[PDB]
PDB file of C-alpha atoms and ligand atoms in Angstrom:
ATOM      1  CA  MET D   1     121.043 -26.449  89.682  1.00  0.00           C
ATOM      2  CA  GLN D   2     120.811 -22.752  91.932  1.00  0.00           C
ATOM      3  CA  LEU D   3     121.821 -22.751  95.051  1.00  0.00           C
ATOM      4  CA  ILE D   4     121.436 -19.689  97.770  1.00  0.00           C
ATOM      5  CA  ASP D   5     124.387 -18.564 100.231  1.00  0.00           C
ATOM      6  CA  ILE D   6     122.670 -17.580 102.876  1.00  0.00           C
ATOM      7  CA  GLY D   7     125.018 -15.880 105.162  1.00  0.00           C
ATOM      8  CA  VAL D   8     128.199 -14.616 103.111  1.00  0.00           C
ATOM      9  CA  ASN D   9     130.541 -12.071 104.926  1.00  0.00           C
ATOM     10  CA  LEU D  10     131.203 -10.106 102.210  1.00  0.00           C
ATOM     11  CA  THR D  11     132.665  -6.717 103.999  1.00  0.00           C
ATOM     12  CA  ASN D  12     135.243  -8.969 105.383  1.00  0.00           C
ATOM     13  CA  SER D  13     138.578  -6.961 104.903  1.00  0.00           C
ATOM     14  CA  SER D  14     140.075 -10.087 103.761  1.00  0.00           C
ATOM     15  CA  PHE D  15     139.135 -10.226 101.009  1.00  0.00           C
ATOM     16  CA  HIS D  16     140.565  -6.834  99.664  1.00  0.00           C
ATOM     17  CA  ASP D  17     137.853  -5.043  98.192  1.00  0.00           C
ATOM     18  CA  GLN D  18     137.546  -7.862  95.242  1.00  0.00           C
ATOM     19  CA  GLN D  19     133.994  -8.566  95.970  1.00  0.00           C
ATOM     20  CA  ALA D  20     132.987  -7.937  92.857  1.00  0.00           C
ATOM     21  CA  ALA D  21     135.053 -11.038  91.028  1.00  0.00           C
ATOM     22  CA  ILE D  22     133.809 -13.482  94.890  1.00  0.00           C
ATOM     23  CA  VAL D  23     130.943 -12.105  93.600  1.00  0.00           C
ATOM     24  CA  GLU D  24     131.576 -12.967  89.766  1.00  0.00           C
ATOM     25  CA  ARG D  25     132.621 -16.945  90.729  1.00  0.00           C
ATOM     26  CA  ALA D  26     129.647 -17.060  92.929  1.00  0.00           C
ATOM     27  CA  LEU D  27     127.008 -16.104  89.776  1.00  0.00           C
ATOM     28  CA  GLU D  28     128.815 -18.641  87.381  1.00  0.00           C
ATOM     29  CA  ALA D  29     129.188 -21.497  90.025  1.00  0.00           C
ATOM     30  CA  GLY D  30     124.901 -21.087  90.123  1.00  0.00           C
ATOM     31  CA  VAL D  31     124.961 -19.162  93.618  1.00  0.00           C
ATOM     32  CA  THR D  32     122.531 -16.360  92.414  1.00  0.00           C
ATOM     33  CA  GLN D  33     121.101 -15.184  95.260  1.00  0.00           C
ATOM     34  CA  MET D  34     123.032 -14.285  98.584  1.00  0.00           C
ATOM     35  CA  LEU D  35     122.497 -12.805 101.270  1.00  0.00           C
ATOM     36  CA  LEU D  36     124.922 -10.690 103.060  1.00  0.00           C
ATOM     37  CA  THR D  37     125.703 -11.054 106.701  1.00  0.00           C
ATOM     38  CA  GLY D  38     125.418  -7.901 108.832  1.00  0.00           C
ATOM     39  CA  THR D  39     127.399  -8.185 112.301  1.00  0.00           C
ATOM     40  CA  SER D  40     127.475  -4.476 113.756  1.00  0.00           C
ATOM     41  CA  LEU D  41     125.553  -0.984 112.597  1.00  0.00           C
ATOM     42  CA  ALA D  42     128.510   0.072 110.972  1.00  0.00           C
ATOM     43  CA  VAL D  43     128.591  -3.611 109.028  1.00  0.00           C
ATOM     44  CA  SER D  44     125.486  -4.127 108.550  1.00  0.00           C
ATOM     45  CA  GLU D  45     125.540  -0.343 106.789  1.00  0.00           C
ATOM     46  CA  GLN D  46     128.797  -1.789 104.574  1.00  0.00           C
ATOM     47  CA  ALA D  47     127.205  -4.656 103.949  1.00  0.00           C
ATOM     48  CA  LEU D  48     123.844  -2.885 102.390  1.00  0.00           C
ATOM     49  CA  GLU D  49     126.707  -0.205 100.324  1.00  0.00           C
ATOM     50  CA  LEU D  50     127.608  -3.018  98.462  1.00  0.00           C
ATOM     51  CA  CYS D  51     124.535  -4.708  97.203  1.00  0.00           C
ATOM     52  CA  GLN D  52     124.104  -1.426  95.829  1.00  0.00           C
ATOM     53  CA  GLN D  53     127.407  -0.912  94.476  1.00  0.00           C
ATOM     54  CA  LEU D  54     127.490  -4.304  93.136  1.00  0.00           C
ATOM     55  CA  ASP D  55     124.017  -5.483  92.173  1.00  0.00           C
ATOM     56  CA  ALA D  56     121.523  -1.844  90.616  1.00  0.00           C
ATOM     57  CA  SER D  57     118.765  -4.455  89.609  1.00  0.00           C
ATOM     58  CA  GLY D  58     118.312  -6.066  93.401  1.00  0.00           C
ATOM     59  CA  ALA D  59     118.232  -9.645  91.622  1.00  0.00           C
ATOM     60  CA  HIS D  60     121.447 -11.349  92.910  1.00  0.00           C
ATOM     61  CA  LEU D  61     123.209  -9.556  96.208  1.00  0.00           C
ATOM     62  CA  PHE D  62     120.753  -8.906  99.755  1.00  0.00           C
ATOM     63  CA  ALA D  63     121.136  -7.535 103.549  1.00  0.00           C
ATOM     64  CA  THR D  64     120.797  -8.893 106.832  1.00  0.00           C
ATOM     65  CA  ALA D  65     120.678  -5.709 109.640  1.00  0.00           C
ATOM     66  CA  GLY D  66     122.035  -6.580 113.235  1.00  0.00           C
ATOM     67  CA  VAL D  67     124.645  -6.648 115.918  1.00  0.00           C
ATOM     68  CA  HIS D  68     126.061 -10.254 116.539  1.00  0.00           C
ATOM     69  CA  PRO D  69     126.825 -11.327 120.159  1.00  0.00           C
ATOM     70  CA  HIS D  70     130.094 -10.734 120.146  1.00  0.00           C
ATOM     71  CA  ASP D  71     129.245  -7.099 119.500  1.00  0.00           C
ATOM     72  CA  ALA D  72     126.396  -6.712 121.733  1.00  0.00           C
ATOM     73  CA  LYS D  73     128.566  -4.626 124.209  1.00  0.00           C
ATOM     74  CA  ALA D  74     128.703  -1.822 121.445  1.00  0.00           C
ATOM     75  CA  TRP D  75     124.391  -1.948 121.817  1.00  0.00           C
ATOM     76  CA  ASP D  76     123.737   1.751 123.034  1.00  0.00           C
ATOM     77  CA  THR D  77     120.433   4.337 123.377  1.00  0.00           C
ATOM     78  CA  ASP D  78     120.921   4.751 119.541  1.00  0.00           C
ATOM     79  CA  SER D  79     121.090   1.281 118.422  1.00  0.00           C
ATOM     80  CA  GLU D  80     117.569   0.067 118.615  1.00  0.00           C
ATOM     81  CA  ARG D  81     116.522   3.532 116.582  1.00  0.00           C
ATOM     82  CA  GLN D  82     119.898   3.100 113.904  1.00  0.00           C
ATOM     83  CA  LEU D  83     119.014  -0.622 113.382  1.00  0.00           C
ATOM     84  CA  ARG D  84     114.886   0.485 113.275  1.00  0.00           C
ATOM     85  CA  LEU D  85     115.862   2.470 110.029  1.00  0.00           C
ATOM     86  CA  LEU D  86     118.200   0.022 108.591  1.00  0.00           C
ATOM     87  CA  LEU D  87     116.049  -2.774 108.401  1.00  0.00           C
ATOM     88  CA  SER D  88     113.163  -0.690 106.766  1.00  0.00           C
ATOM     89  CA  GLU D  89     115.871  -0.697 103.716  1.00  0.00           C
ATOM     90  CA  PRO D  90     114.043  -2.884 100.979  1.00  0.00           C
ATOM     91  CA  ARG D  91     117.113  -4.993  99.849  1.00  0.00           C
ATOM     92  CA  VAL D  92     117.725  -5.512 104.351  1.00  0.00           C
ATOM     93  CA  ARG D  93     115.234  -9.048 104.896  1.00  0.00           C
ATOM     94  CA  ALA D  94     116.475  -9.870 107.818  1.00  0.00           C
ATOM     95  CA  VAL D  95     117.550  -8.406 111.528  1.00  0.00           C
ATOM     96  CA  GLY D  96     120.318 -10.341 112.418  1.00  0.00           C
ATOM     97  CA  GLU D  97     123.339 -12.019 112.631  1.00  0.00           C
ATOM     98  CA  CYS D  98     122.434 -11.245 116.012  1.00  0.00           C
ATOM     99  CA  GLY D  99     121.608 -14.406 118.942  1.00  0.00           C
ATOM    100  CA  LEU D 100     124.267 -15.824 122.026  1.00  0.00           C
ATOM    101  CA  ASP D 101     127.583 -17.030 121.873  1.00  0.00           C
ATOM    102  CA  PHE D 102     128.999 -18.417 125.750  1.00  0.00           C
ATOM    103  CA  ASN D 103     132.151 -20.306 124.349  1.00  0.00           C
ATOM    104  CA  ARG D 104     133.772 -16.917 122.765  1.00  0.00           C
ATOM    105  CA  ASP D 105     132.093 -14.600 125.705  1.00  0.00           C
ATOM    106  CA  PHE D 106     133.876 -11.498 123.295  1.00  0.00           C
ATOM    107  CA  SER D 107     130.960  -9.315 125.473  1.00  0.00           C
ATOM    108  CA  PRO D 108     129.690 -10.140 128.477  1.00  0.00           C
ATOM    109  CA  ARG D 109     126.853 -12.281 128.511  1.00  0.00           C
ATOM    110  CA  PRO D 110     123.972 -10.147 130.089  1.00  0.00           C
ATOM    111  CA  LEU D 111     124.974  -6.981 127.447  1.00  0.00           C
ATOM    112  CA  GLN D 112     124.116 -10.742 124.660  1.00  0.00           C
ATOM    113  CA  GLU D 113     121.061 -10.583 126.403  1.00  0.00           C
ATOM    114  CA  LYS D 114     119.783  -7.490 126.480  1.00  0.00           C
ATOM    115  CA  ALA D 115     121.198  -6.582 122.322  1.00  0.00           C
ATOM    116  CA  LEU D 116     119.019 -10.254 121.853  1.00  0.00           C
ATOM    117  CA  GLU D 117     116.218  -9.036 123.172  1.00  0.00           C
ATOM    118  CA  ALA D 118     115.952  -5.679 121.750  1.00  0.00           C
ATOM    119  CA  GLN D 119     116.545  -7.267 117.764  1.00  0.00           C
ATOM    120  CA  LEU D 120     113.715  -9.834 118.825  1.00  0.00           C
ATOM    121  CA  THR D 121     111.450  -6.679 119.457  1.00  0.00           C
ATOM    122  CA  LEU D 122     112.483  -5.372 116.228  1.00  0.00           C
ATOM    123  CA  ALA D 123     112.115  -8.401 113.888  1.00  0.00           C
ATOM    124  CA  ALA D 124     108.790  -9.535 115.765  1.00  0.00           C
ATOM    125  CA  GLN D 125     106.615  -4.886 115.282  1.00  0.00           C
ATOM    126  CA  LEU D 126     109.193  -5.315 111.623  1.00  0.00           C
ATOM    127  CA  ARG D 127     107.235  -8.497 110.754  1.00  0.00           C
ATOM    128  CA  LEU D 128     111.198 -10.039 109.583  1.00  0.00           C
ATOM    129  CA  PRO D 129     112.188 -12.996 110.140  1.00  0.00           C
ATOM    130  CA  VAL D 130     115.864 -13.658 112.495  1.00  0.00           C
ATOM    131  CA  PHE D 131     119.308 -14.458 111.673  1.00  0.00           C
ATOM    132  CA  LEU D 132     120.485 -16.200 114.888  1.00  0.00           C
ATOM    133  CA  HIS D 133     123.832 -17.304 115.489  1.00  0.00           C
ATOM    134  CA  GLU D 134     124.429 -20.070 118.595  1.00  0.00           C
ATOM    135  CA  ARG D 135     127.773 -20.913 120.514  1.00  0.00           C
ATOM    136  CA  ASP D 136     127.194 -22.966 123.567  1.00  0.00           C
ATOM    137  CA  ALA D 137     124.159 -21.158 124.183  1.00  0.00           C
ATOM    138  CA  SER D 138     121.361 -23.633 123.337  1.00  0.00           C
ATOM    139  CA  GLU D 139     120.071 -23.441 126.685  1.00  0.00           C
ATOM    140  CA  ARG D 140     119.300 -20.064 127.096  1.00  0.00           C
ATOM    141  CA  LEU D 141     118.382 -19.416 123.486  1.00  0.00           C
ATOM    142  CA  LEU D 142     115.916 -21.243 123.418  1.00  0.00           C
ATOM    143  CA  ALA D 143     114.522 -19.552 127.237  1.00  0.00           C
ATOM    144  CA  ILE D 144     114.512 -16.767 125.640  1.00  0.00           C
ATOM    145  CA  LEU D 145     113.064 -17.630 122.314  1.00  0.00           C
ATOM    146  CA  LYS D 146     110.546 -19.003 124.180  1.00  0.00           C
ATOM    147  CA  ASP D 147     108.774 -15.433 124.627  1.00  0.00           C
ATOM    148  CA  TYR D 148     109.388 -14.753 121.412  1.00  0.00           C
ATOM    149  CA  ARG D 149     108.590 -17.474 118.989  1.00  0.00           C
ATOM    150  CA  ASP D 150     105.163 -16.776 118.515  1.00  0.00           C
ATOM    151  CA  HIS D 151     105.211 -13.206 117.262  1.00  0.00           C
ATOM    152  CA  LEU D 152     108.140 -14.171 114.562  1.00  0.00           C
ATOM    153  CA  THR D 153     107.567 -14.712 111.309  1.00  0.00           C
ATOM    154  CA  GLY D 154     110.575 -16.583 111.281  1.00  0.00           C
ATOM    155  CA  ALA D 155     114.256 -17.799 112.680  1.00  0.00           C
ATOM    156  CA  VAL D 156     117.143 -19.537 111.783  1.00  0.00           C
ATOM    157  CA  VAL D 157     119.508 -21.128 113.235  1.00  0.00           C
ATOM    158  CA  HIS D 158     122.390 -20.473 111.324  1.00  0.00           C
ATOM    159  CA  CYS D 159     125.904 -22.424 111.037  1.00  0.00           C
ATOM    160  CA  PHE D 160     124.143 -25.289 113.287  1.00  0.00           C
ATOM    161  CA  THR D 161     126.970 -27.153 114.501  1.00  0.00           C
ATOM    162  CA  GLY D 162     125.631 -28.284 117.656  1.00  0.00           C
ATOM    163  CA  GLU D 163     124.362 -32.079 118.535  1.00  0.00           C
ATOM    164  CA  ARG D 164     120.723 -34.181 118.713  1.00  0.00           C
ATOM    165  CA  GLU D 165     119.329 -32.931 121.730  1.00  0.00           C
ATOM    166  CA  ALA D 166     119.032 -29.027 120.663  1.00  0.00           C
ATOM    167  CA  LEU D 167     118.929 -29.822 116.624  1.00  0.00           C
ATOM    168  CA  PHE D 168     115.419 -31.237 117.850  1.00  0.00           C
ATOM    169  CA  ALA D 169     114.565 -28.320 120.500  1.00  0.00           C
ATOM    170  CA  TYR D 170     115.228 -25.970 117.933  1.00  0.00           C
ATOM    171  CA  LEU D 171     113.195 -28.167 115.346  1.00  0.00           C
ATOM    172  CA  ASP D 172     110.104 -27.945 118.003  1.00  0.00           C
ATOM    173  CA  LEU D 173     110.355 -24.900 118.192  1.00  0.00           C
ATOM    174  CA  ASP D 174     109.451 -24.235 114.447  1.00  0.00           C
ATOM    175  CA  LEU D 175     113.500 -22.822 113.360  1.00  0.00           C
ATOM    176  CA  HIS D 176     114.297 -22.576 110.185  1.00  0.00           C
ATOM    177  CA  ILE D 177     118.145 -25.273 110.083  1.00  0.00           C
ATOM    178  CA  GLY D 178     121.333 -23.619 107.830  1.00  0.00           C
ATOM    179  CA  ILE D 179     124.487 -25.397 107.588  1.00  0.00           C
ATOM    180  CA  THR D 180     127.502 -24.598 105.983  1.00  0.00           C
ATOM    181  CA  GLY D 181     131.120 -26.227 105.220  1.00  0.00           C
ATOM    182  CA  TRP D 182     131.223 -27.414 109.381  1.00  0.00           C
ATOM    183  CA  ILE D 183     129.645 -30.509 108.248  1.00  0.00           C
ATOM    184  CA  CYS D 184     132.349 -31.411 105.174  1.00  0.00           C
ATOM    185  CA  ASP D 185     134.928 -31.166 108.759  1.00  0.00           C
ATOM    186  CA  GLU D 186     136.115 -34.404 108.869  1.00  0.00           C
ATOM    187  CA  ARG D 187     138.024 -33.433 112.647  1.00  0.00           C
ATOM    188  CA  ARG D 188     134.514 -31.840 114.040  1.00  0.00           C
ATOM    189  CA  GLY D 189     131.316 -31.753 111.569  1.00  0.00           C
ATOM    190  CA  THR D 190     130.758 -36.037 111.235  1.00  0.00           C
ATOM    191  CA  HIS D 191     128.454 -35.676 114.492  1.00  0.00           C
ATOM    192  CA  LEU D 192     126.541 -33.858 111.656  1.00  0.00           C
ATOM    193  CA  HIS D 193     125.921 -36.271 109.217  1.00  0.00           C
ATOM    194  CA  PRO D 194     122.912 -38.756 110.796  1.00  0.00           C
ATOM    195  CA  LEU D 195     121.725 -35.732 111.777  1.00  0.00           C
ATOM    196  CA  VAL D 196     121.222 -33.691 108.732  1.00  0.00           C
ATOM    197  CA  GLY D 197     118.568 -36.113 107.376  1.00  0.00           C
ATOM    198  CA  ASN D 198     116.171 -34.841 110.087  1.00  0.00           C
ATOM    199  CA  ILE D 199     116.105 -31.504 109.355  1.00  0.00           C
ATOM    200  CA  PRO D 200     112.175 -31.052 106.981  1.00  0.00           C
ATOM    201  CA  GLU D 201     112.518 -29.658 103.355  1.00  0.00           C
ATOM    202  CA  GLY D 202     110.869 -26.474 104.097  1.00  0.00           C
ATOM    203  CA  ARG D 203     113.286 -26.258 107.060  1.00  0.00           C
ATOM    204  CA  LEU D 204     116.821 -26.351 105.466  1.00  0.00           C
ATOM    205  CA  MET D 205     119.184 -23.477 104.301  1.00  0.00           C
ATOM    206  CA  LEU D 206     122.653 -23.499 102.889  1.00  0.00           C
ATOM    207  CA  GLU D 207     125.120 -20.964 103.551  1.00  0.00           C
ATOM    208  CA  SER D 208     129.688 -20.388 102.985  1.00  0.00           C
ATOM    209  CA  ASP D 209     129.803 -18.132 105.818  1.00  0.00           C
ATOM    210  CA  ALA D 210     132.633 -16.772 103.671  1.00  0.00           C
ATOM    211  CA  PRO D 211     135.758 -16.208 104.409  1.00  0.00           C
ATOM    212  CA  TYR D 212     134.894 -18.635 107.323  1.00  0.00           C
ATOM    213  CA  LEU D 213     134.567 -22.490 106.881  1.00  0.00           C
ATOM    214  CA  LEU D 214     136.524 -23.548 103.774  1.00  0.00           C
ATOM    215  CA  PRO D 215     135.019 -26.832 103.054  1.00  0.00           C
ATOM    216  CA  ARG D 216     137.914 -29.130 103.710  1.00  0.00           C
ATOM    217  CA  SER D 217     137.475 -31.916 101.508  1.00  0.00           C
ATOM    218  CA  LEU D 218     137.620 -28.740  98.533  1.00  0.00           C
ATOM    219  CA  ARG D 219     140.131 -29.133  96.027  1.00  0.00           C
ATOM    220  CA  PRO D 220     141.997 -27.383  95.016  1.00  0.00           C
ATOM    221  CA  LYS D 221     142.214 -25.141  98.171  1.00  0.00           C
ATOM    222  CA  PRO D 222     143.094 -21.420  97.538  1.00  0.00           C
ATOM    223  CA  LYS D 223     146.240 -21.102  99.402  1.00  0.00           C
ATOM    224  CA  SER D 224     144.334 -18.146 101.326  1.00  0.00           C
ATOM    225  CA  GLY D 225     142.995 -20.395 103.368  1.00  0.00           C
ATOM    226  CA  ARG D 226     139.776 -17.675 102.209  1.00  0.00           C
ATOM    227  CA  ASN D 227     136.483 -19.901 101.870  1.00  0.00           C
ATOM    228  CA  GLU D 228     134.252 -18.267  99.310  1.00  0.00           C
ATOM    229  CA  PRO D 229     130.378 -18.381  97.883  1.00  0.00           C
ATOM    230  CA  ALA D 230     130.780 -20.211  94.920  1.00  0.00           C
ATOM    231  CA  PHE D 231     132.332 -23.141  96.138  1.00  0.00           C
ATOM    232  CA  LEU D 232     129.043 -24.007  98.210  1.00  0.00           C
ATOM    233  CA  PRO D 233     128.616 -26.933  95.801  1.00  0.00           C
ATOM    234  CA  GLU D 234     130.610 -28.961  97.886  1.00  0.00           C
ATOM    235  CA  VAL D 235     128.721 -28.145 100.824  1.00  0.00           C
ATOM    236  CA  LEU D 236     125.630 -29.125  98.803  1.00  0.00           C
ATOM    237  CA  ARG D 237     127.450 -32.241  97.600  1.00  0.00           C
ATOM    238  CA  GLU D 238     128.173 -33.289 101.564  1.00  0.00           C
ATOM    239  CA  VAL D 239     124.711 -32.350 102.436  1.00  0.00           C
ATOM    240  CA  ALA D 240     123.214 -34.281  99.494  1.00  0.00           C
ATOM    241  CA  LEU D 241     124.715 -37.439 100.269  1.00  0.00           C
ATOM    242  CA  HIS D 242     123.997 -37.571 104.078  1.00  0.00           C
ATOM    243  CA  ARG D 243     120.587 -36.731 103.301  1.00  0.00           C
ATOM    244  CA  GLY D 244     120.406 -39.725 100.714  1.00  0.00           C
ATOM    245  CA  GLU D 245     119.198 -37.114  98.079  1.00  0.00           C
ATOM    246  CA  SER D 246     120.176 -35.427  94.309  1.00  0.00           C
ATOM    247  CA  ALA D 247     122.351 -32.665  94.823  1.00  0.00           C
ATOM    248  CA  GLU D 248     119.797 -31.787  92.118  1.00  0.00           C
ATOM    249  CA  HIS D 249     117.107 -31.999  94.634  1.00  0.00           C
ATOM    250  CA  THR D 250     118.491 -30.768  97.574  1.00  0.00           C
ATOM    251  CA  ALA D 251     119.662 -27.353  95.539  1.00  0.00           C
ATOM    252  CA  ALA D 252     116.376 -27.258  94.844  1.00  0.00           C
ATOM    253  CA  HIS D 253     114.437 -27.250  98.146  1.00  0.00           C
ATOM    254  CA  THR D 254     117.130 -25.383 100.091  1.00  0.00           C
ATOM    255  CA  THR D 255     116.897 -22.624  96.906  1.00  0.00           C
ATOM    256  CA  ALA D 256     112.948 -22.359  97.700  1.00  0.00           C
ATOM    257  CA  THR D 257     113.117 -22.658 101.468  1.00  0.00           C
ATOM    258  CA  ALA D 258     115.814 -19.782 101.536  1.00  0.00           C
ATOM    259  CA  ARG D 259     113.476 -17.521  98.631  1.00  0.00           C
ATOM    260  CA  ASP D 260     110.202 -17.913 100.773  1.00  0.00           C
ATOM    261  CA  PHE D 261     112.480 -17.111 104.438  1.00  0.00           C
ATOM    262  CA  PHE D 262     113.665 -14.444 103.156  1.00  0.00           C
ATOM    263  CA  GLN D 263     111.272 -12.882 100.606  1.00  0.00           C
ATOM    264  CA  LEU D 264     113.667 -13.124  97.049  1.00  0.00           C
ATOM    265  CA  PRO D 265     112.431 -12.281  94.126  1.00  0.00           C
ATOM    266  CA  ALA D 266     112.047 -15.204  91.105  1.00  0.00           C
ATOM    267  CA  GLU D 267     114.848 -16.229  88.599  1.00  0.00           C
ATOM    268  CA  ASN D 268     115.199 -14.430  86.356  1.00  0.00           C
ATOM    269  CA  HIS D 277     132.935 -16.505  81.949  1.00  0.00           C
ATOM    270  CA  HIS D 278     135.423 -14.007  82.787  1.00  0.00           C
ATOM    271  CA  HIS D 279     139.519 -13.422  83.510  1.00  0.00           C
ATOM    272  CA  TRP D 280     139.523 -10.840  85.463  1.00  0.00           C
ATOM    273  CA  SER D 281     137.611 -12.362  87.760  1.00  0.00           C
ATOM    274  CA  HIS D 282     139.221 -16.284  88.267  1.00  0.00           C
ATOM    275  CA  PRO D 283     143.304 -14.316  89.327  1.00  0.00           C
ATOM    276  CA  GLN D 284     145.046 -17.572  90.105  1.00  0.00           C
ATOM    277  CA  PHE D 285     147.120 -18.059  93.454  1.00  0.00           C
ATOM    278  CA  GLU D 286     145.525 -15.502  94.640  1.00  0.00           C
ATOM    279  CA  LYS D 287     146.631 -13.552  97.573  1.00  0.00           C
TER     280      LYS D 287
HETATM  281 ZN1   ZN J 301     127.742 -17.209 113.173  1.00  0.00          ZN
END
């Protein structure tokens, strides 16, 4: 039962340089490949450097490069050029995380749109798929994508949390959908239960978004409250259940989808990497 975690924020400070153990626990749990998410030029560089530092063969760790809407305001005159270079690294497999977040509004909206469009333009010219974030902005995101979609090899709406109409609109644009532990959240994720089954096989992928979105049904829960990619099987369990399919079958098809979407290569216990009650 191999799984692929399409979005790990493995450079996060909150991991306090314990990425090696985190990766070891993931592999041991059968999460055999992971996409390390870039959220700014600096964090995209660090994500790539982590792939290089931890995984010399290029079998397990890959990166995305992009600028997140929270950080769109840092998009500047040298951004396009630096990102184009980073994207041409072979371990870098997608453009993103990029998109729109009108809930937080941590960058002005026009600056968000500007950064998004420049990244979609790069994705189109470089023939790389897009890793999208959207929150309270489905209407703007759909309008923007309309002019790009025909020119993209593909795009995923990562960590989809919205309602039926938004889902079907994304599906109608032929977008992939990524599902996280938000689905295990009894307070805000139950509305996904009737929806996950509408995502065709071949368009559904899974992701932890670690350290965020620790599945609320997990046990034992880490005292830190940090999510990690080894907890992805709890997401698989819940997604399989509401799709009415075996865990083995959901695992198989999401993994095949992710391999294709990111162009990943085919397949082929330690005590130090399982500290108990870690800070
Ligand atoms: Zn996101």
